[PDB]
């Protein structure tokens with residue numbers, strides 16, 4: 009009776025999920041929704057069991073009673089003796105990236121420029137940068153800071169969606185799923201790489217994984233790290249190698265969430281699923297790899313080494329931390345106690 013229903017966001021994730029479902033022998037089956045919020049609703053209704061969420065979405069799900077179950081864990085440097093599944097998470101660096109050729113663009117001259125965001129409500133793409141901007145300008149009119157943007161999830165007829173391109177046909181403009189060309193970490197970075205936007209709000213890893221031949225994708229194969237600069241909060245610009253000293257915040261890792269009454273069951277299935285399809289899995293790269301999808305980051309981030317257990321059985325507030333949680337609450341005053349559904 010240990011069957012788990014995963015929630016896929018958009019048709020590309022659905023496709024990957026179906027493959028996983030086939031290989032799992034129906035231990036995992038798939039539900040699909042157009043947006044992450046819709047997937048959250050499916051979980052609440054008990055029509056789906058779980059999905060992997062960015063920190064920003066964990067906050068939404070948390071208010072509605074969903075709980076973190078396992079966290080994405082990437083390549084470490086320390087803790088190297090301890091196993092991946094037991095190793096603590098280090099969190100990723102949220103950064104703002106610009107073209108080197110775009111001289112004189114600093115943090116202090118971002119107003120009226122063109123911005124690329126992963127999606128509304130996400131940590132590096134929205135919550136961190138817009139929280140900082142709202143704070144600095146003392147205004148809730150974050151919708152009027154940049155001249156134009158691609159922020160998937162915003163009103164398709166607003167300036168916040170002006171730069172979004174939609175799918176292979178121009179349909180689904182600004183939808184918060186991989187159908188939108190400039191959606192997510194990869195899409196937001198592509199938005200910058202193609203000079204549609206002036207700045208991209210992504211995490212540190214995105215820059216590295218899509219430059220100097222790390223990505224064989226059409227738009228990325230010719231990109232060089234040296235051609236990019238990170239915007240620091242002190243008004244300086246640094247090479248992408250200096251992320252440790254030039255980031256906007258440290259973000260809590262993406263995590264699997266489920267309804268609390270299903271948490272234990274979801275955990276045991278997943279631990280077994282990754283033994284089969286994880287980084288060193290029995291059937292990866294032979295038959296299926298759960299953490300691969302050609303830089304598209306479908307279901308999970310492509311740089312995920314393993315899903316790790318969470319020390320101290322944390323609530324959603326403890327995981328994201330009190331630092332990050334307070335930032336979100338303040339930004340959400342612009343747009344204390346309620347589930348948003």
Ligand SMILES: CCCCCCC/C=C\CCCCCC(=O)O[C@H](COC(=O)CCCCCC)CO[C@H]1O[C@H](CO)[C@@H](O)[C@H](O[C@@H]2O[C@H](C)[C@H](N)[C@H](O)[C@H]2NC(C)=O)[C@H]1O
Pocket residue numbers: 087096097098099100258259260261319322325326327328329330331
């Ligand atoms: C006071 C208000 C707190 C905020 C709200 C409550 C949060 C409650 C949970 C957080 C507990 C704090 C750290 C405990 C931890 O598990 O982590 C390290 C301990 O690891 C081990 O070796 C355990 C080995 C176990 C063997 C025994 C079986 C050391 O911690 C330090 O190093 C860790 C990796 O080297 C980072 O995870 C951690 O930061 C964390 O990194 C991420 C970036 C994320 N953004 C987190 O939000 C951040 N921490 C906080 C508190 O925000 C960092 O401070």
Ligand SMILES: *[C@@H]1O[C@H](CO)[C@@H](O[C@@H]2O[C@H](CO)[C@@H](O[C@@H]3O[C@H](CO)[C@@H](O)[C@H](O)[C@@H]3O)[C@H](O)[C@H]2NC(C)=O)[C@H](O)[C@H]1NC(C)=O
Pocket residue numbers: 136139140143330331334335338
């Ligand atoms: C935008 O501005 C608000 C207002 O300052 C920032 O919220 C504030 O965040 C700090 C740190 O999270 C909170 O201060 C304190 O933290 C210490 C722990 O170090 C704690 O001991 C104190 O009780 C206190 O919370 C502060 O409470 C909080 N202020 C308010 C009014 O909620 C927010 O972080 C800023 N946004 C961004 C993205 O920086």
Ligand SMILES: *[C@@H]1O[C@H](CO)[C@@H](O[C@@H]2O[C@H](CO)[C@@H](O)[C@H](O)[C@H]2NC(C)=O)[C@H](O)[C@H]1NC(C)=O
Pocket residue numbers: 083084085101212213216217222251252311
């Ligand atoms: C930013 O992210 C990049 C890529 O995720 C990190 O570079 C990787 O670091 C590991 C060891 O920590 C190396 O073994 C990998 O080969 C690197 N990946 C690539 C694609 O080059 C980098 O360490 C991160 N920077 C910070 C400051 O966290």
Ligand SMILES: [Fe+3]
Pocket residue numbers: 062063130131132259262
């Ligand atoms: Fe994220």
Ligand SMILES: [Zn+2]
Pocket residue numbers: 255257258
């Ligand atoms: Zn820092």
Ligand SMILES: [Zn+2]
Pocket residue numbers: 320321322323326
């Ligand atoms: Zn606790």
